[PDB]
Design goal:
There is one protein chain. The protein has 290 residues and is an alpha/beta fold. It has three domains: 1-78 and 180-200, D-Maltodextrin-Binding Protein, domain 2 (3-Layer(aba) Sandwich), CATH 3.40.190; 79-179, 3-Layer(aba) Sandwich (D-Maltodextrin-Binding Protein, domain 2); 201-285, Double Stranded RNA Binding Domain (2-Layer Sandwich). The chain contains nine helices and 13 strands. The protein has a five-stranded mixed sheet. Strand 1 (3-9), helix 1 (13-27) and strand 2 form a beta-alpha-beta unit. Bound molecules: ligand DPM. Ligand DPM binds next to helix 3, strand 8 and helix 5. Keywords: Porphyrin biosynthesis, Transferase. Pfam families: Porphobil_deam (PF01379), Porphobil_deamC (PF03900).
């Protein structure tokens, strides 16, 4: 006579791996709950949750919409994985060692624009596929290197030595929420929220909250060359690095804010960058994306 928590999940191997990881972690609490996965886009999952067809969903935080519909909430952010972008080179060159005219594979304008801002003599080309697929294309096709999230490589079990070079935020500011998971549920589901609380990692949640406020006030998302990475410093301060880039890498807006309040920090970063023209650039890229 236990409540069975229905967890909706995307069909991919990464999404199901993340979903099962969360369920296994909640089971460590030894509380009287059962768990079941229902394979299920973001609108679809949120509708089913609002419809009570499912009780919760596990998303990569960088895939979460900046704005959740009324009634839903992020109920838990667990301990962050590696936040960094990772460079994997076919022949093992670091970024500064790649040959002139090297082609780096990524469909992310955030990633590509930042790389082009460092070296405009390389080329960024679209690529698709899960990690396994992109790694195969690196060996067999006309890419000299690809960019992947360190977090996805880790969660898929790839060795740390698969990575040629972990890119620090000073080279490539990560996508907002990269390496973090979001557990979404109904805001009034106090029983599930109580179960989720022990899995929540307050330091990760506070940093990501600052990133997400910046994202929301810039009206950012996946397709946008916008980036933000927050971290907790000794003493409780959050340091937020925020960035907006033109697709060609020749315009870079960058802002560093260190303070106590994640909402104030995120809001100030957006205010400063908006005043410099970064929001106009975001709007124009959105229009071109049609
Ligand atoms: C918004 C966006 N999504 C993806 C693809 C993606 N989403 C989640 C992951 C795994 C890591 C995580 O959960 O943090 C991935 C795969 C990955 O980042 O390697 C992207 C990247 C598209 C690409 O580079 O082609 C993005 C855009 C962005 O990172 O800004």
């Amino acid at each position: 006579h236990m409540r069975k928590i229905i967890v909706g999940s995307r069909r991919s191997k990464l999404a199901l791996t993340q979903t099962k990881w969360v369920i296994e972690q909640l089971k460590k609490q030894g509380l009287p709950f059962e768990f079941e996965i229902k394979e299920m886009f973001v609108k679809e999952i949120e509708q089913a949750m609002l419809d009570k067809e499912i009780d919760m969903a596990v998303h990569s935080m960088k895939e979460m919409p900046a704005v959740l519909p009324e009634g839903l909430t992020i109920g838990c952010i667990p301990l962050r994985e590696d936040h960094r972008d990772a460079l994997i080179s076919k022949n093992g060159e670091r970024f500064e060692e790649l040959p002139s005219g090297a082609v780096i594979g990524t469909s992310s304008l955030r990633r590509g624009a930042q790389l082009l801002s460092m070296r405009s003599d390389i080329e960024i080309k679209w690529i698709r596929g899960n990690i396994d697929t992109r790694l195969e294309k690196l060996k067999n096709e006309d890419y000299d290197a690809i960019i992947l999230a360190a977090a996805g490589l880790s969660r898929m079990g790839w060795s740390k030595d698969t990575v040629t070079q972990y890119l620090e935020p000073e080279i490539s500011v990560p996508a907002v929420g990269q390496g973090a998971l979001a557990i979404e549920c109904r805001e009034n589901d106090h029983e599930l929220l109580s179960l989720l609380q022990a899995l929540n990692h307050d330091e990760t949640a506070r940093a990501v909250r600052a990133e997400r406020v910046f994202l929301k006030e810039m009206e950012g998302g996946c397709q946008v060359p916008i980036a933000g990475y927050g971290r907790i410093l000794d003493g409780g301060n959050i340091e937020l690095t925020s960035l907006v880039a033109s697709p060609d890498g020749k315009t870079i807006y960058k802002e560093h804010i260190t303070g106590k309040d994640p909402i104030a920090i995120g809001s100030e970063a957006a205010e400063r960058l908006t005043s410099q023209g970064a929001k106009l650039l975001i709007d124009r890229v959105k229009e071109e994306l049609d």
